Amino acid sequence: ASNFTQFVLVDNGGTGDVTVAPSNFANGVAEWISSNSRSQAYKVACSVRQSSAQNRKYTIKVEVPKVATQTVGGVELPVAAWRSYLNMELTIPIFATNSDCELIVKAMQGLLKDGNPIPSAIAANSGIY
Amino acid sequence: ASNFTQFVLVDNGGTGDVTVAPSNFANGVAEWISSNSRSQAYKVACSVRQSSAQNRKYTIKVEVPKVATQTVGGVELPVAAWRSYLNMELTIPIFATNSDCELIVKAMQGLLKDGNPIPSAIAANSGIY
Amino acid sequence: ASNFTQFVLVDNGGTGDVTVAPSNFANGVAEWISSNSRSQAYKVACSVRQSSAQNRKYTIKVEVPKVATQTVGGVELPVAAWRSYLNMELTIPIFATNSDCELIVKAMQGLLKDGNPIPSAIAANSGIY
Amino acid sequence: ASNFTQFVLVDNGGTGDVTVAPSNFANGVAEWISSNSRSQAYKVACSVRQSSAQNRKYTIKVEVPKVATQTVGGVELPVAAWRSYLNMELTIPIFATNSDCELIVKAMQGLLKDGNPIPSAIAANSGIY
Amino acid sequence: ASNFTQFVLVDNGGTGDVTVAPSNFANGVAEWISSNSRSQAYKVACSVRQSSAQNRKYTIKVEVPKVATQTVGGVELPVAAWRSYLNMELTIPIFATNSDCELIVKAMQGLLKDGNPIPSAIAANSGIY
Amino acid sequence: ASNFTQFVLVDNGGTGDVTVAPSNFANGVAEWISSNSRSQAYKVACSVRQSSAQNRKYTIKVEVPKVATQTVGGVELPVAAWRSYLNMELTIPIFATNSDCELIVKAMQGLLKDGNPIPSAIAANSGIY
RNA sequence: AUGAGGAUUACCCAUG
RNA sequence: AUGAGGAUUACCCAUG
RNA sequence: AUGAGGAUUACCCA
């Protein structure tokens, strides 16, 4: 393979989708950003490393812009009021086969699937109740 | 409503789906576990807190076990050979609209969608390249 | 352009070939790992450095596992019964042109070509006689 | 039977081939040197030893000279302007059968096969990128 | 894509053009060198870092050698009589759009265009006056 | 000659080009600025000096305005969010002839030519990958 | 607060 | 961080 | 830096 390619991060049904493309590879950390200024870009970074003798660990970081009332190309301060940060760490024991790993991926997809508790709480500015 | 409902964590297409159900809300940490002995159960935990004055932070944790039967003291016990841990923290500014939040959910869904770079690396015990 | 890609480490006809894919390029050490359990995987690591004022030194490392299943208390895990370790260091003066480097590479390929003294002693659990 | 024989180190078609012939097998170190001035000659040395209770370790060494003439005071001598040094150590557990050793040899030949990442970085005065 | 490709550094109009090719990406520093012994090679290095919280900084270095052959110890070695060094650092705010960035690239191109003040002073061993 | 003259810094094909004209010469440092306020001007400064016994050194500084969403003639703070800074230092050994210097100029032009890695990374808000 | 810090994973570490 | 600070050029210096 | 020094292999030793 060669997985370092462009992909659709936000699928808005073909029209107005957000595609994110390879942008940096310094230090084995793959980065992908959207076609925007860096203050307004959708950003994704990923890396794997053997965290310890028994585990491998993926660190995935995502940055998503606050879009409501955004001024395209404008200087928007404070930076913290306009951006959301996602930080995921996936620890996987060295015994995990490809199949085991495929299941872990399904568990992550199910967790965020539409209609499930977590993605619905987040989308509605809520917690669990 | 009450978004504290059960959902299918691992969709194995109707047969051998792993569903997870509400199991505890003590200390403001919503927990869900599968129908197993607590030693072999999948587990999902979620909590939200107003981390800063202008942010809110969601902490989500998923544990995927590799089930086994272990002979301890000449007796067999339901056990987990190992566990894979997902730990994510999402920081969203208080200025984020519900539609801004839906954009964050869509970004996390596309990130893990089948065939995209990251879920591909993971499922194949590989890095991005 | 990129030479940090996947490649065939063990050519077994076109089936049973061992392929090693990029995994991590941290701190000037490029590492490649084969697929499936990291515990049973092949590993190749490589780095270059200016060893001294006139020399550049390459450090290559390869691990060939003896795949096996470990069973303990009824819990079986995929492991490497043992590993074979190869460590090589190649020093090249800064005066070497590209033609000199190509020759160094041919000297290395010839040393290990089938039928020559060295690869034949190794493949037979033997020394020189 | 004997594997302490002459062989082609650098295969240059069938002309300009560098052949290295047995020279001395003192103290368990088999050495091979190419013809003509010892000062401009290629050298290959090899030895095996029981590194520990379970391991046997091979130590291979190769030297590729940069042939040149030294002129001092009108007296010219055949010398090597500089040398490239290769040092490798291969550890193999005593549990390795002949089939395991053959595989180790294929792993070594593949690592250096033309076009693969390592031989290509070297032949081009480069690292991994 | 992968913008890590070879390019012609000195366009001598098809004949005696100096092209430079990707040669290392260790430590997040993209490097390119020409086909010479590392002692006589042209070299280009580039790296980007988020210097401040609101800036990004590119560090670019070019080395142009004056090639010579030097007799050291009565032996001739490929050498560089001297080297000319270009060191540039470009700081761009995170609020810069892609079109803002293209304006920076156009400004640097016009600056060095033939016949403009600066490239004229340099080429004539002169100052601006 | 007399090179201290007006020139086109940004060439937008005759229509809407940015011309920069001599503006200061205090201390042997030639300066050129566009026709704007100093907070929004395109600025260029240049000077040569014998850095040491063996080298002469050119220090070239450029400032480029963030134009997207700019308000012409307006007060835009913070200053750092609206401006990019280029700082080049060219060290040239005293042995460099005019011809040697012309080549150094070509190397600088080739580096920034359109389509080459560096100017493409910069223009796309990217690094090398 | 931060860390491509670690975990046996709602714990621990470091720095600030 | 800054320097029309230096270099043998991914290093060193000074100040802050 | 070297070592036909060792390894659980980018670690440890003289």
PDB file of N, CA and C in Angstrom, chain F residues 58-97:
ATOM      1  N   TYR F  58      26.070  39.313   2.677  1.00  0.00           N
ATOM      2  CA  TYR F  58      24.933  40.171   2.326  1.00  0.00           C
ATOM      3  C   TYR F  58      23.786  39.859   3.276  1.00  0.00           C
ATOM      4  N   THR F  59      23.150  40.880   3.824  1.00  0.00           N
ATOM      5  CA  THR F  59      22.006  40.688   4.700  1.00  0.00           C
ATOM      6  C   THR F  59      20.851  41.346   3.955  1.00  0.00           C
ATOM      7  N   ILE F  60      19.860  40.545   3.581  1.00  0.00           N
ATOM      8  CA  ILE F  60      18.698  41.000   2.834  1.00  0.00           C
ATOM      9  C   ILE F  60      17.473  40.727   3.668  1.00  0.00           C
ATOM     10  N   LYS F  61      16.671  41.743   3.903  1.00  0.00           N
ATOM     11  CA  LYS F  61      15.479  41.600   4.710  1.00  0.00           C
ATOM     12  C   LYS F  61      14.281  42.065   3.947  1.00  0.00           C
ATOM     13  N   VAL F  62      13.212  41.277   3.978  1.00  0.00           N
ATOM     14  CA  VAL F  62      11.983  41.592   3.263  1.00  0.00           C
ATOM     15  C   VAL F  62      10.798  41.498   4.230  1.00  0.00           C
ATOM     16  N   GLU F  63       9.792  42.351   4.084  1.00  0.00           N
ATOM     17  CA  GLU F  63       8.584  42.302   4.903  1.00  0.00           C
ATOM     18  C   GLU F  63       7.459  42.275   3.896  1.00  0.00           C
ATOM     19  N   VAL F  64       6.520  41.357   4.045  1.00  0.00           N
ATOM     20  CA  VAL F  64       5.399  41.224   3.120  1.00  0.00           C
ATOM     21  C   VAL F  64       4.099  41.283   3.915  1.00  0.00           C
ATOM     22  N   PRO F  65       3.139  42.127   3.498  1.00  0.00           N
ATOM     23  CA  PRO F  65       1.868  42.249   4.208  1.00  0.00           C
ATOM     24  C   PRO F  65       0.853  41.120   4.005  1.00  0.00           C
ATOM     25  N   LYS F  66       0.042  40.847   5.029  1.00  0.00           N
ATOM     26  CA  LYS F  66      -1.020  39.859   4.915  1.00  0.00           C
ATOM     27  C   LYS F  66      -2.078  40.702   4.240  1.00  0.00           C
ATOM     28  N   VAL F  67      -2.441  40.317   3.034  1.00  0.00           N
ATOM     29  CA  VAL F  67      -3.385  41.055   2.241  1.00  0.00           C
ATOM     30  C   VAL F  67      -4.861  40.601   2.335  1.00  0.00           C
ATOM     31  N   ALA F  68      -5.119  39.315   2.548  1.00  0.00           N
ATOM     32  CA  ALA F  68      -6.491  38.849   2.648  1.00  0.00           C
ATOM     33  C   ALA F  68      -7.144  39.466   3.855  1.00  0.00           C
ATOM     34  N   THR F  69      -8.271  40.123   3.609  1.00  0.00           N
ATOM     35  CA  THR F  69      -9.088  40.831   4.596  1.00  0.00           C
ATOM     36  C   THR F  69      -8.478  42.129   5.137  1.00  0.00           C
ATOM     37  N   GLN F  70      -7.421  42.599   4.494  1.00  0.00           N
ATOM     38  CA  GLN F  70      -6.734  43.820   4.862  1.00  0.00           C
ATOM     39  C   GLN F  70      -7.656  45.014   4.652  1.00  0.00           C
ATOM     40  N   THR F  71      -7.497  46.057   5.460  1.00  0.00           N
ATOM     41  CA  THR F  71      -8.262  47.299   5.323  1.00  0.00           C
ATOM     42  C   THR F  71      -7.216  48.322   4.950  1.00  0.00           C
ATOM     43  N   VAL F  72      -7.288  48.827   3.735  1.00  0.00           N
ATOM     44  CA  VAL F  72      -6.281  49.758   3.294  1.00  0.00           C
ATOM     45  C   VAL F  72      -6.228  51.047   4.060  1.00  0.00           C
ATOM     46  N   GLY F  73      -5.075  51.281   4.671  1.00  0.00           N
ATOM     47  CA  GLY F  73      -4.853  52.477   5.440  1.00  0.00           C
ATOM     48  C   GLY F  73      -5.337  52.339   6.852  1.00  0.00           C
ATOM     49  N   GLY F  74      -5.860  51.177   7.205  1.00  0.00           N
ATOM     50  CA  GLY F  74      -6.380  50.980   8.536  1.00  0.00           C
ATOM     51  C   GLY F  74      -5.372  50.589   9.571  1.00  0.00           C
ATOM     52  N   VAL F  75      -5.742  50.714  10.840  1.00  0.00           N
ATOM     53  CA  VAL F  75      -4.882  50.338  11.942  1.00  0.00           C
ATOM     54  C   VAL F  75      -5.183  48.873  12.233  1.00  0.00           C
ATOM     55  N   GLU F  76      -4.245  47.991  11.906  1.00  0.00           N
ATOM     56  CA  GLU F  76      -4.396  46.561  12.103  1.00  0.00           C
ATOM     57  C   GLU F  76      -3.448  45.985  13.135  1.00  0.00           C
ATOM     58  N   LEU F  77      -3.994  45.567  14.264  1.00  0.00           N
ATOM     59  CA  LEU F  77      -3.223  44.988  15.360  1.00  0.00           C
ATOM     60  C   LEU F  77      -3.717  43.559  15.629  1.00  0.00           C
ATOM     61  N   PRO F  78      -2.847  42.671  16.116  1.00  0.00           N
ATOM     62  CA  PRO F  78      -1.440  42.887  16.428  1.00  0.00           C
ATOM     63  C   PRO F  78      -0.581  42.873  15.159  1.00  0.00           C
ATOM     64  N   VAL F  79       0.440  43.707  15.140  1.00  0.00           N
ATOM     65  CA  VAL F  79       1.340  43.818  14.012  1.00  0.00           C
ATOM     66  C   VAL F  79       1.838  42.467  13.496  1.00  0.00           C
ATOM     67  N   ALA F  80       2.076  41.544  14.410  1.00  0.00           N
ATOM     68  CA  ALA F  80       2.586  40.217  14.086  1.00  0.00           C
ATOM     69  C   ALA F  80       1.655  39.296  13.345  1.00  0.00           C
ATOM     70  N   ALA F  81       0.367  39.603  13.365  1.00  0.00           N
ATOM     71  CA  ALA F  81      -0.618  38.773  12.700  1.00  0.00           C
ATOM     72  C   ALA F  81      -0.783  39.190  11.257  1.00  0.00           C
ATOM     73  N   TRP F  82      -0.251  40.348  10.918  1.00  0.00           N
ATOM     74  CA  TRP F  82      -0.417  40.875   9.598  1.00  0.00           C
ATOM     75  C   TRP F  82       0.800  40.992   8.749  1.00  0.00           C
ATOM     76  N   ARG F  83       1.924  40.432   9.176  1.00  0.00           N
ATOM     77  CA  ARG F  83       3.158  40.561   8.417  1.00  0.00           C
ATOM     78  C   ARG F  83       4.071  39.370   8.428  1.00  0.00           C
ATOM     79  N   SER F  84       4.680  39.081   7.279  1.00  0.00           N
ATOM     80  CA  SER F  84       5.633  37.989   7.138  1.00  0.00           C
ATOM     81  C   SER F  84       7.004  38.615   7.016  1.00  0.00           C
ATOM     82  N   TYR F  85       8.008  37.945   7.552  1.00  0.00           N
ATOM     83  CA  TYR F  85       9.365  38.450   7.529  1.00  0.00           C
ATOM     84  C   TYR F  85      10.330  37.468   6.912  1.00  0.00           C
ATOM     85  N   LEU F  86      11.079  37.910   5.912  1.00  0.00           N
ATOM     86  CA  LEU F  86      12.075  37.075   5.260  1.00  0.00           C
ATOM     87  C   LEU F  86      13.400  37.653   5.635  1.00  0.00           C
ATOM     88  N   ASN F  87      14.346  36.804   5.993  1.00  0.00           N
ATOM     89  CA  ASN F  87      15.667  37.255   6.374  1.00  0.00           C
ATOM     90  C   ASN F  87      16.698  36.337   5.737  1.00  0.00           C
ATOM     91  N   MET F  88      17.463  36.857   4.787  1.00  0.00           N
ATOM     92  CA  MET F  88      18.472  36.068   4.082  1.00  0.00           C
ATOM     93  C   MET F  88      19.884  36.515   4.375  1.00  0.00           C
ATOM     94  N   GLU F  89      20.799  35.574   4.508  1.00  0.00           N
ATOM     95  CA  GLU F  89      22.187  35.917   4.699  1.00  0.00           C
ATOM     96  C   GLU F  89      22.957  35.087   3.730  1.00  0.00           C
ATOM     97  N   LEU F  90      23.731  35.759   2.898  1.00  0.00           N
ATOM     98  CA  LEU F  90      24.535  35.112   1.895  1.00  0.00           C
ATOM     99  C   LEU F  90      25.993  35.385   2.232  1.00  0.00           C
ATOM    100  N   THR F  91      26.729  34.338   2.589  1.00  0.00           N
ATOM    101  CA  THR F  91      28.153  34.428   2.917  1.00  0.00           C
ATOM    102  C   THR F  91      28.917  34.010   1.675  1.00  0.00           C
ATOM    103  N   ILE F  92      29.846  34.832   1.216  1.00  0.00           N
ATOM    104  CA  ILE F  92      30.605  34.531   0.019  1.00  0.00           C
ATOM    105  C   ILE F  92      32.095  34.734   0.289  1.00  0.00           C
ATOM    106  N   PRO F  93      32.921  33.675   0.138  1.00  0.00           N
ATOM    107  CA  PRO F  93      34.368  33.724   0.356  1.00  0.00           C
ATOM    108  C   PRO F  93      35.011  34.753  -0.541  1.00  0.00           C
ATOM    109  N   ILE F  94      36.038  35.429  -0.047  1.00  0.00           N
ATOM    110  CA  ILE F  94      36.689  36.469  -0.823  1.00  0.00           C
ATOM    111  C   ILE F  94      37.301  36.028  -2.135  1.00  0.00           C
ATOM    112  N   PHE F  95      37.365  34.737  -2.395  1.00  0.00           N
ATOM    113  CA  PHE F  95      37.954  34.259  -3.631  1.00  0.00           C
ATOM    114  C   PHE F  95      36.967  34.182  -4.770  1.00  0.00           C
ATOM    115  N   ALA F  96      35.685  34.360  -4.472  1.00  0.00           N
ATOM    116  CA  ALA F  96      34.639  34.263  -5.481  1.00  0.00           C
ATOM    117  C   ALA F  96      34.725  35.327  -6.553  1.00  0.00           C
ATOM    118  N   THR F  97      34.886  34.908  -7.794  1.00  0.00           N
ATOM    119  CA  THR F  97      34.976  35.834  -8.905  1.00  0.00           C
ATOM    120  C   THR F  97      33.585  36.292  -9.278  1.00  0.00           C
TER     121      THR F  97
END
